[PDB]
């Protein structure tokens with residue numbers, strides 16, 4: 001249906017993309033490329049799924065070669081600077097090779113690339129078409145959920161200073 | 176025909192959409208008197224110099240070359256701390272680079288594109304879309320670096336520090 | 351076909367080619383010389399040099415030459431003869447760039463005529479590959495000396 | 511040239527050399543200087559008219 | 571300070587200039603009774619002299635050995651109020667007068683009798699021009715680049731050689 005029934009449905013939001021509930025009140029996709037916006041939405045979503053898994057795991061696990069922070073966000077400040085720089089350039093190399101060296105909005109989609117697609121299915125979960133369509137919508141909604149959830153986990157961990165699960169087991173309101 | 180940058184003024188006759196950073200912006204009509212292609216070569220060269228110069232005003236805040244490790248992070252003092260043999264070598268190297276521009280302008284002025292000094296070692300701009308994006312991006316980052324360096328220079332005159340140090344210490348106004 | 355950074359667009363290919371062959375030959379001499387210096391010592395040199403290794407020998411002979419020592423002017427003499435050779439063979443590298451008959455690196459120096467006898471379709475590539483290794487090997491040798499006082503044979507023999 | 515046309519004077523010894531005058535009449539006889547040109551500035555003598563040859567006068 | 575000069579607030583010869591200037595006025599005031607107009611006038615002069623010396627002392631002027639304030643005009647910003655800033659004010663007014671007079675001369679050329687407009691000035695049109703001069707740098711530079719300030723060399727009368 002229409003997500004915001006009093007507002008008119010945005011003209012560029014056809015139902016073809018998965019996760020389309022007609023929710024564009026501010027007015028994007030009337031200015032920017034929906035192909036670029038969808039690539040940004042899936043990229044943000046997958047990064048935040050990995051981020052929420054990383055936050056939960058680092059609250060428990062720690063590699064022996066690394067120290068342990070007070071919180072998984074404090075884990076950033078005890079890993080050596082050169083390590084962070086190596087991770088940054090490794091992610092940059094992946095970003096370069098995956099997009100074929102076209103990263104700008106102007107050239108990223110000059111090769112007829114499909115938004116969110118990098119030809120990544122080693123386990124072949126997208127072999128079936130209808131199952132693939134369902135997994136597309138599942139992906140976009142789990143990505144959206146992990147985006148909000150990552151925001152929540154990071155800010156509560158900064159505020160309380162006591163993790164996620166230890167925070168829940170020792171909940172202490174603002175005083 | 177009307178200017179795009181300034182919608183109530185007429186279009187400047189000697190600038191055109193073909194030029195990468197075109198906005199229709201020539202209120203005082205320099206191109207009505209001077210050669211448009213000379214102005215473009217000058218704008219591109221000023222932009223490249225200011226791109227390096229903005230990076231150079233910021234970078235020794237982070238790290239210095241070991242030789243100049245004792246030198247100051249205020250750039251306007253580090254200018255005088257360098258020996259004249261060093262500045263002579265800098266001037267000679269820039270002179271060697273400027274021989275190619277002295278040969279481009281004044282001899283084959285009409286052969287080529289503005290700023291085309293035959294320096295494309297990594298073979299970018301082969302893709303036409305990438306070439307367009309990079310041309311416009313070079314012009315806009317050059318203009319932004321001109322404004323940025325002009326700022327940073329006069330700020331270093333007022334607060335006797337570098338940009339980052341000034342920001343961190345919140346020395347934002349004349350003491 | 352190895353040129354990922356496109357540095358042959360930034361200079362003349364002929365100048366680069368002759369410069370590469372010269373770097374390869376000089377480094378061939380440097381790498382072979384350092385290994386030979388450890389294996390064999392020309393007579394009398396142990397009093398002027400002691401037991402200094404590759405780069406140390408340059409500084410120590412020039413230190414002795416910095417006094418008025420007659421028996422320490424090796425560096426000046428090698429510098430003189432290589433400079434003389436580079437001065438008189440200097441027009442060759444400008445003739446090649448001007449379109450001249452001589453190819454990069456050929457000074458027609460074949461006394462034994464081993465290259466002339468058999469067709470020289472491989473000896474060229476032999477020299478180029480061996481010299482490319484010679485440059486990298488010299489690099490290795492010098493910086494490893496700059497960390498540990500071992501020479502070629504000493505550093506290769508053990509594993510610190 | 512023609513009468514009522516605007517002309518640039520090319521006689522180097524004219525007071526009005528490289529200025530604009532207006533053609534008054536053009537003689538048809540064997541006259542050496544048949545074009546009569548009037549100016550708005552007066553010369554040092556206070557004259558504002560002079561005769562010129564076609565070669566000396568160029569249209570603007 | 572600059573060029574071996576002394577700030578006027580601590581130079582002792584500036585102080586002697588002020589003291590001698592006030593004694594010169596006080597000995598003239600010693601010949602008049604209190605409420606008279608010459609006494610009031612001389613007291614006003616003494617106050618004016620003291621005010622001028624006090625203001626000069628606190629202004630950052632640099633006195634010489636003579637004790638008279640000196641002006642530094644090499645371009646340094648600590649002394650820009652002595653030549654650079656008065657100079658910017660002058661060039662704005664002078665360029666205004668030049669731009670306004672040029673605009674009236676070009677208007678007067680398109681008149682019925684151009685020489686009657688210059689000895690009998692059209693005051694409403696000339697006041698219209700005098701008001702326009704406040705943006706003379708932009709108007710004159712746009713005039714230049716549009717090919718309307720400078721005339722070409724072949725519409726200018728020259729001598730035979």
Ligand code: CLA
Nearest residue numbers: 065066079080081082083084085086087088089090091093
């Ligand atoms: C090409 C493969 C390769 C190699 C040889 C290395 C080598 C190294 N890594 Mg690893 N790393 C790699 C890929 C690689 N990295 C990738 C692809 C990732 C991300 C997935 C990481 C993530 C990573 C982390 C998270 C950490 C390292 C660290 C280190 C260095 C430790 C030395 C030390 O403690 O004192 C050296 C101390 C210094 C102050 C000198 C600075 C280190 C030099 C510059 C490392 C240079 C590596 C080089 C640039 C290759 C990286 C390319 C890039 C695309 C990743 C060692 C040289 C650790 C580290 O550096 O801690 C200090 C560390 O914590 N690495």
Ligand code: CLA
Nearest residue numbers: 148149151152153155156159160168170171172173174175
């Ligand atoms: C869903 C998103 C969301 C989130 C993440 C937060 C987060 C927060 N809110 Mg906000 N809030 C929200 C929605 C949200 N609020 C909405 C929609 C309203 C209505 C305008 C408010 C009104 C509100 C007030 C008035 C106050 C907060 C406060 C707080 C802080 C509570 C911290 C703590 O220790 O509490 C731990 C507390 C709990 C776990 C108990 C929560 C149960 C509450 C008491 C029940 C309220 C039921 C209510 C009648 C529902 C009607 C809905 C309707 C009127 C909109 C935290 C920053 C407080 C704050 O800033 O204190 C410093 C505060 O006083 N919030």
Ligand code: CLA
Nearest residue numbers: 376379380382383384386387390391392395399407408424
């Ligand atoms: C870049 C090359 C280079 C440099 C700077 C040096 C410099 C030095 N060497 Mg080392 N050396 C070299 C190459 C080099 N050598 C080579 C190639 C060898 C033979 C494998 C040696 C063998 C060697 C020994 C055994 C000793 C030195 C020693 C010394 C020092 C005194 C000079 C001397 O007696 O040399 C002697 C060097 C030689 C006799 C080698 C000359 C080989 C020539 C160049 C071959 C030319 C062949 C070809 C026909 C010429 C083509 C000409 C064409 C270009 C026109 C000095 C620091 C001495 C020292 O103080 O050590 C502690 C010492 O004992 N060197």
Ligand code: CLA
Nearest residue numbers: 667668669670671672673674675688691695696697699700
């Ligand atoms: C407003 C009219 C006007 C304008 C724009 C100029 C412009 C110029 N004059 Mg000319 N000039 C003028 C009036 C004007 N002049 C008058 C009235 C006289 C007679 C006194 C002269 C006598 C004169 C001489 C002798 C010289 C110039 C020179 C110059 C040039 C350099 C600036 C200068 O030296 O100023 C100098 C200005 C003066 C000497 C006199 C100016 C007198 C007043 C201040 C200006 C006229 C005001 C006018 C009445 C405006 C009324 C406006 C109203 C109707 C709206 C420049 C081309 C010089 C030159 O050729 O350099 C290349 C030069 O040597 N001028």
Ligand SMILES: CC1=C(C#C/C(C)=C/C=C/C(C)=C/C=C/C=C(C)/C=C/C=C(\C)C#CC2=C(C)C[C@@H](O)CC2(C)C)C(C)(C)C[C@H](O)C1
Nearest residue numbers: 049050052053120121122123124125142145146149152153
């Ligand atoms: C694509 C590809 C594959 C792949 C893959 C991968 C790596 C898939 C990874 C999937 C992952 C990691 C999904 C994670 C989702 C997390 C979500 C939705 C958030 C949950 C938390 C919430 C809502 C919360 C909360 C909370 C907040 C904020 C604050 C707290 O105080 C309280 C609370 C805890 C309640 C493979 C390799 C399989 C093959 C395949 O062929 C191709």
Ligand SMILES: CC1=C(C#C/C(C)=C/C=C/C(C)=C/C=C/C=C(C)/C=C/C=C(\C)C#CC2=C(C)C[C@@H](O)CC2(C)C)C(C)(C)C[C@H](O)C1
Nearest residue numbers: 226227229230295296297298299316319320323326327338
């Ligand atoms: C050419 C070419 C390639 C290349 C290359 C290279 C070397 C490219 C280099 C590119 C560079 C160095 C670009 C830098 C731009 C800097 C900017 C826009 C900064 C502006 C500063 C601002 C706006 C500011 C500010 C500030 C103000 C004033 C107040 C301050 O208190 C604070 C604040 C900081 C806010 C390669 C080699 C790959 C090959 C290829 O075949 C061809």
Ligand SMILES: CC1=C(C#C/C(C)=C/C=C/C(C)=C/C=C/C=C(C)/C=C/C=C(\C)C#CC2=C(C)C[C@@H](O)CC2(C)C)C(C)(C)C[C@H](O)C1
Nearest residue numbers: 378379381382460461462483484487490491494501502505
């Ligand atoms: C031209 C010609 C003539 C001639 C001639 C001449 C002078 C010919 C000379 C040829 C030469 C001198 C060849 C030497 C090459 C050296 C190499 C390849 C070394 C690489 C070292 C490496 C990889 C290393 C290393 C490592 C070790 C062991 C040590 C460690 O501490 C360091 C490290 C771990 C890095 C003749 C007269 C024949 C006539 C003919 O008609 C024309």
Ligand SMILES: CCCCCCCCCCCCO[C@@H]1O[C@H](CO)[C@@H](O[C@H]2O[C@H](CO)[C@@H](O)[C@H](O)[C@H]2O)[C@H](O)[C@H]1O
Nearest residue numbers: 322323325326327329330333334345346347348349350
């Ligand atoms: C984000 C800004 C984007 C463009 C900014 C560029 C500014 C252009 C030039 C303007 C010069 C800045 O203006 C300069 O800074 C501040 C502004 O009140 C003034 O500084 C004064 O007020 C500030 C503000 O409380 C006091 O902290 C300070 O002690 C006092 O000197 C200077 O007297 C003025 O010279």
